[PDB]
Motif scaffolding. Structure first.
Motif, mmCIF file in Angstrom:
data_model
loop_
_atom_site.group_PDB
_atom_site.id
_atom_site.type_symbol
_atom_site.label_atom_id
_atom_site.label_comp_id
_atom_site.label_asym_id
_atom_site.label_seq_id
_atom_site.Cartn_x
_atom_site.Cartn_y
_atom_site.Cartn_z
ATOM 1 N N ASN A 258 0.927 -1.259 0.167
ATOM 2 C CA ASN A 258 0.061 0.189 -0.126
ATOM 3 C C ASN A 258 0.853 1.220 0.064
ATOM 4 O O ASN A 258 1.311 1.671 1.084
ATOM 5 N N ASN B 179 4.283 2.019 4.775
ATOM 6 C CA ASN B 179 5.628 2.702 4.996
ATOM 7 C C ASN B 179 6.598 1.685 4.485
ATOM 8 O O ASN B 179 7.533 2.310 3.622
ATOM 9 N N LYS C 165 -0.023 4.287 -0.758
ATOM 10 C CA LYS C 165 -0.502 5.190 -0.100
ATOM 11 C C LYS C 165 -0.462 6.397 -1.047
ATOM 12 O O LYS C 165 -0.463 6.363 -2.142
ATOM 13 N N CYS C 166 -0.420 7.759 -0.454
ATOM 14 C CA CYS C 166 -0.200 8.938 -1.241
ATOM 15 C C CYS C 166 1.284 9.138 -1.503
ATOM 16 O O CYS C 166 1.933 10.127 -0.950
ATOM 17 N N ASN C 167 2.070 8.476 -2.265
ATOM 18 C CA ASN C 167 3.611 8.460 -2.571
ATOM 19 C C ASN C 167 3.946 7.848 -3.683
ATOM 20 O O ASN C 167 3.324 7.200 -4.252
ATOM 21 N N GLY C 168 5.132 8.625 -4.016
ATOM 22 C CA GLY C 168 5.630 8.142 -5.426
ATOM 23 C C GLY C 168 6.055 9.266 -6.455
ATOM 24 O O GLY C 168 5.154 10.209 -6.330
#
Lengths: 247, 241
Positions: free
Chosen positions: A9, A232, A11-14
Motif C-alpha cells: 500500500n 511505510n 498510499k499517497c507516495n511516489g
C-alpha cells in the motif's frame, strides 16, 4: 493451505522515477503467482505506469473505489471503470479513509457490493481503537464491522480481510504477534459462524498494522495470519524481503 | 480574457469510448493561444486521455488532496499531479461538497496546495434551492468566494465556476450572479484582477443554450458535464469561438 497474500500500500507516495526503479528492484525477485499472491496498490494516476513496468506475476489494484456506479460523481472511480481497465484489486475501508473522509460501515458494504458486482477483488480493512480495546470491546467492534459486509462474500478467494490494530497505530502502544494471532483467530470464528467452516478456512486474513523486515517472519508464522497489508515499508526496495517471509 | 470551455466527464468512460470521443475532438480546429479548452477525465483515465488528445487540448483531474504526500490512502496530492505535468484541477465541485462533505476550509486548503505546486485551479461554488428561496444567494456566494479568493496570485491560473446547485437557470439569472461574483473580486482584489479572471457557468450546458449563455457580458465559458460526454460537445466549444 491458504494462498499467502502480501500487499504493497504505497498510499499517497511516489514520483514516476521512484516507481520505475522500485518496480525494477521488485521484479528481479523470483516467485510463483500460483502459490503466493503479491499485490501493489499505487496511487490512481500511477496505475497505468506501474502496471506496465511490473511483470505479470505481480497483481495490481487501487486504494479506494466508489460506492456509486457511473454517473455524476465528480472525482470518483467506479468499479465499472476499474473493471474496464482490468484493475484486479481494490482496497476498501482503510483506517485513513474511515478517519479523514468519514467512511462508514455502510460505505464499506456498498463499496464491496459494487466491487463484486463488477468482478473485482476486495481487500477489506477494519479494526478497533485503543479505548474500544481498553473496554474489552475488541470482539464486539470487529464483529459489528465484519458483519456489516461479510454476508456479501461470494467467492472466498476474492475477498481478503485485513485487521488493522488502530489501537497500536500512532498511539505509543505496539501489537505483539500473539495479540494479532488472537484477534485473527476471533475474526476467523466470526466468518465460521456467519458463513461456514469451509469459507472461514478459505478466507485470507492479513495483518495491517506496522509490518517491516524485523517483525514480518514472526507474524506470518502465526496460524491465522495469512499475509500483510504493508504501508511505510512497501515504499522501500527491502519490501522484497517481506515478500520472502511468506515465500 | 480567454474564453474557457471545460469537459467534466465526472465518473464516466471506457478505454474505447475515450479513444473515439478524443478523436472526434481532435479534428475540430482551434487556436489554444486564443481559447482554453480543458478535459477532466477520471484519474485512472488521465494518461490514456492525455496521450490521445492533441497538445491544443489542456487536461486536468477532477479533485486534488488537501494533504501533501504521506499516509492518506486513496488521495492524489498536488505534488504528484505536478510531477505528472497535470495542468488543471477541479476544486469544490457540488458533488464533492454533497457526497464527500467537502467544506470551504477544504476548498481553501486544496487551492493553496494546488497553487503551491504550480497547478491551475477550476474552483466551484453555488447556492442550494432553499438558500435561493430565502434570498441568500448573494450571501452564500460571497461567503464561499471569500473563503479562498485572497489566495489567487495569477488571475489567469484560477478560474471560477458558478454552479447553480438549485437547478433550469436562465441566462439573465446567471449573468446577474456572474456580475456580482466579478464585483466581489473587484472590490476585494482589484480592477485589473476582476476583469482578468474567468468566471464560468457550471449548470446544465448543452448545444441548445450554450450560445445564449456565452454572449452574456460576465459569462466567460462553461464547466460542462453530461453534454461533454458527447461528440456534439465540439459545438459547445464552437459557441465560444
Amino acid at each position: 493451505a491458504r494462498k499467502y497474500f502480501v500487499a504493497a500500500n504505497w498510499k499517497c507516495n511516489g514520483t514516476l522515477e521512484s516507481i520505475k526503479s522500485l518496480t525494477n528492484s521488485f521484479n528481479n525477485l523470483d516467485f510463483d503467482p500460483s502459490k503466493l499472491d503479491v499485490v501493489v496498490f499505487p496511487v490512481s494516476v500511477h496505475y497505468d505506469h506501474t502496471r506496465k513496468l511490473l511483470q505479470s506475476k505481480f497483481s495490481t489494484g487501487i486504494q479506494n473505489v466508489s460506492k456509486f456506479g457511473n454517473g455524476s460523481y465528480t472525482g470518483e472511480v467506479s468499479a465499472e471503470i476499474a473493471k474496464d481497465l482490468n484493475i484486479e484489486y481494490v482496497i476498501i475501508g482503510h483506517a485513513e479513509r474511515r478517519k479523514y473522509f468519514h467512511e462508514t460501515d455502510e460505505d464499506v458494504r456498498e463499496k464491496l457490493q459494487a466491487s463484486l458486482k463488477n468482478n473485482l477483488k476486495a481487500v477489506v480493512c477494519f479494526g478497533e481503537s485503543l479505548e474500544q480495546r481498553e473496554q474489552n470491546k475488541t470482539i464486539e467492534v470487529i464483529t459489528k464491522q465484519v458483519k456489516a459486509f461479510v454476508d456479501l462474500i461470494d467467492n472466498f478467494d476474492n475477498v481478503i480481510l485485513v485487521y488493522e490494530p488502530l489501537w497500536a497505530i500512532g498511539t505509543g502502544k505496539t501489537a505483539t504477534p500473539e495479540q494479532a494471532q488472537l484477534v485473527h483467530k476471533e475474526i476467523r470464528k466470526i466468518v465460521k459462524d456467519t458463513c461456514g467452516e469451509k469459507q472461514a478456512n478459505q478466507i485470507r486474513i492479513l495483518y495491517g498494522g506496522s509490518v517491516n523486515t524485523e517483525n514480518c517472519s514472526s507474524l506470518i508464522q502465526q496460524e491465522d495470519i495469512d499475509g500483510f497489508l504493508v504501508g511505510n515499508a512497501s515504499l522501500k526496495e527491502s519490501f522484497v524481503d517481506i515478500i520472502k517471509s511468506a515465500m
